[PDB]
């Protein structure tokens, strides 16, 4: 939900 399905700031935003 909160993470753009790509955690670890792969596309800049994530967790």
Could you please report the per-residue DSSP string of 1-15? --S-S-TTTTTS---
- Sequence-ordered list of residues with C-beta below 8 angstroms from that of 2, at least 6 positions apart, any chain: 15
Do the Cβ atoms of 14 and 7 come closer than 8 Å?
yes
Q: Are 3 and 10 in contact (CB under 8 A)?
A: no
The full length of the chain comes to 15
- Tokens read off for 3: 């993470």
Q: How far apart are CA 1 and CA 9, in angstroms?
A: 15
CA atoms within 13 A on the CB side of 11: 4
At residue 10, φ and ψ (nearest 5 deg) are -60, -45
């Amino acid at each position: 939900a909160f993470q753009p399905t790509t955690p670890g700031n792969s596309p800049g935003v994530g967790h």
